[PDB]
């Protein structure tokens with residue numbers, strides 16, 4: 001079972017859209033909170049989103065932890081890349097806070113900036129990628145049956161295939177005029193994987209308060 | 225499908241067959257020693273791979289559309305697809321029976337073989353890819369189209385990217401058409417599954433680079449040709 005509604009919803013419940021506050025590069029112990037806030041919201045929305053995706057919570061606890069840990073970066077990059085379509089020349093975070101080429105170091109990112117903008121943002125922009133498409137792609141990213149340590153392999157493979165069908169169907173009816181639309185959407189995934197590979201650590205995990213291992217932060221977020 | 229697409233696919237399958245394996249001469253010219261049984265399996269693997277990359281360039285050079293690109297973009301695409309396209313070549317020589325790869329000399333190479341050669345670090349993931357591909361029952365046409373699709377991918381430092389993308393579109397259209405015709409139980413799903421391979425190839429390709437750098441830790445030298453084409457020195 002894969003309801004296209006359930007998917008559009010999950011991406012909506014997290015649909016961020018508030019100001020357009022450029023980040024302040026100063027130790028005014030305030031930016032530290034604007035960044036910290038953007039982080040907390042971004043990561044909460046990550047797990048909040050995953051739980052709203054059809055049958056995700058029906059997976060073994062250990063498996064939903066592994067899936068998020070693995071897809072973490074790709075999922076986030078996809079998220080902030082899509083809502084960065086409005087920004088003229090910058091990346092838009094959850095706080096509504098935005099980053100730029102110069103104000104990129106803090107908030108991780110930095111050397112994925114140029115590439116994120118040129119291969120994702122601009123591409124999504126000139127393609128008019130909508131939240132439903134994004135929702136499907138991110139869900140596809142999430143249900144990676146090849147992630148290691150996963151138990152419900154076949155279960156995940158099937159859930160992913162269903163999302164392919166949903167997105168395949170959604171595009172044929174929304175753009176009967178653009179046959180390549182489906183493929184054009186899926187071809188954003190390799191670019192996304194490449195950019196993610198350039199990361200080396202889970203994005204924004206250190207702007208988080210106190211210490212707590214990744215698997216634990218996730219384990220409790222998936223229960224809260 | 226369409227009378228023109230079948231032509232394109234006929235052509236691709238042909239080129240694929242034309243450059244599948246290397247020359248009898250080039251192969252024999254390899255196994256001719258000096259050092260122990262370890263540095264040997266390593267020399268075979270690396271030397272044969274050189275031929276493999278050469279074959280890939282031969283195939284790419286003849287793909288409709290390639291000649292319409294700027295020399296600089298051609299070099300860029302070829303450099304970038306080498307490590308990726310070779311995973312296909314590898315998967316096509318995978319034997320399910322022995323969980324191994326049948327090299328040119330029919331000598332099947334396994335985890336142990338690569339391990340002995342000093343490349344046990346990535347062999348698992350490599351074999352895993354071979355199984356994944358196998359389970360999808362990918363045929364010659366699909367492999368050929370997919371290879372073309374991989375070759376005409378958006379890559380960094382591309383001059384006429386848009387020109388590459390338009391070329392890729394033609395092959396993507398061919399693939400879809402081919403898949404709709406022969407594949408019915410969710411053609412569109414198989415189509416997406418095949419494209420998902422491209423994204424996995426970014427990972428395998430990245431692993432190949434990681435392993436090359438790791439050869440420096442050990443005291444293994446990567447043949448110049450390979451080290452160069454893959455810029456394994458940066």
Ligand SMILES: CC(C)CC[C@@H](O)[C@](C)(O)[C@H]1CC[C@@]2(O)C3=CC(=O)[C@@H]4C[C@@H](O)[C@@H](O)C[C@]4(C)[C@H]3CC[C@]12C
Nearest residue numbers: 244245246269270272273276313314317325326327328
């Ligand atoms: C660092 C670099 C050398 C590593 C490359 C390794 O990871 C790979 C990808 O695992 C290499 C090792 C040897 C290999 O080049 C081959 C041997 C053959 O005999 C044949 C030559 C030619 O008919 C190819 O169409 C298929 C095959 C199986 C190639 C494919 C890729 C392989 C299997």
